[PDB]
Curated annotation (Swiss-Prot):
PROSITE patterns: RIBOSOMAL_L6_2 (PS00700). This is Large ribosomal subunit protein uL6. The lineage of its organism: Eukaryota, Fungi, Dikarya, Ascomycota, Saccharomycotina. PANTHER family: 60S RIBOSOMAL PROTEIN L9, 60S/50S RIBOSOMAL PROTEIN L6/L9. The keyword Hydrolase does not apply. Component of the large ribosomal subunit. Mature ribosomes consist of a small (40S) and a large (60S) subunit. The 40S subunit contains about 32 different proteins and 1 molecule of RNA (18S). The 60S subunit contains 45 different proteins and 3 molecules of RNA (25S, 5.8S and 5S).
Length: 189
RNA sequence: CUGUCUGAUCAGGCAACGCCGCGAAGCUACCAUCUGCUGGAUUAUGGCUGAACGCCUCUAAGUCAGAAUCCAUGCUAGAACG
């Protein structure tokens, strides 16, 4: 129906800065720096003050307006990742065969290696994304910790681990073995 | 090797390739031997982040993986007016 104007407000905490220029957002905080390209969306920005930013869609239909809260959430995730960080936790689940998980460095590249999944001789290796750190928890058995500044990279890389451990040609209601995300949260709670 | 002809011998001719054994060379047989490559993008499907719709959601923007598929790599020809 082409709403004349829709607005959202970005809250930027006391220790972050947000530089925006030609739909390229650069978010600096105590934990580092994150940048996101928004050239695929028609939006405009205004600086209310040092603690707030207005995001506006002029004369937008239903779908274009739907793409405004999405932008706000993506940039807010940039802020909360450069302040608090992002931590996902994965539990190793199996009935009989334990799942052997190791962080290796083949060719200077960190890889997650999964061995003995359902007794298979095949070895599964999942690349570790840049800016993401994996770690075997030393306080909970059979648990992998995925941490970083970028929620997108952290969650996608945890998903890559989860997807690589799919059971085939068996009743997956009975054969529940896998590596599953058990906790999504921040590094600095 | 047979029949016949050159008188015999030797050496030969003919039998509308006379017949039999072997037979190189050449050709040839899953009847013999050798050889048949590796990158990218996808479909179905499963996902991530994420609004619409204060929740939710793989989908709307964006995005990951993924088939004997597709485009290449490689192989054959080389436009007889490139």
């Amino acid at each position: 129906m082409k709403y004349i104007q829709t607005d959202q407000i970005l809250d930027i905490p006391e220790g972050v800065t947000v530089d925006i220029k030609a739909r390229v957002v650069k978010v600096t905080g105590p934990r580092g720096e994150l940048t996101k390209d928004l050239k695929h969306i028609d939006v405009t920005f205004n600086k209310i003050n040092n603690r707030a930013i207005k995001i506006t869609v002029h004369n937008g239909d239903r779908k274009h307006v739907a793409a405004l809260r999405t932008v706000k959430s993506l940039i807010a995730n940039l802020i909360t990742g450069v302040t608090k960080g992002y931590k996902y936790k994965m539990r190793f689940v199996y009935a009989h065969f334990p799942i052997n998980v190791n962080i290796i460095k083949k060719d200077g590249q960190d890889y997650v290696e999964i061995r003995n999944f359902l007794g298979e001789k095949r070895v599964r290796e999942v690349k570790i994304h840049e800016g993401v750190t994996m770690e075997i928890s030393s306080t909970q058995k059979d648990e992998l910790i995925v941490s970083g500044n970028s929620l997108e990279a952290v969650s996608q890389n945890a998903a890559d681990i989860q997807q690589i451990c799919r059971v085939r040609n068996k009743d997956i209601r009975k054969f529940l073995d896998g590596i599953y995300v058990s906790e999504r949260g921040t590094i600095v709670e």
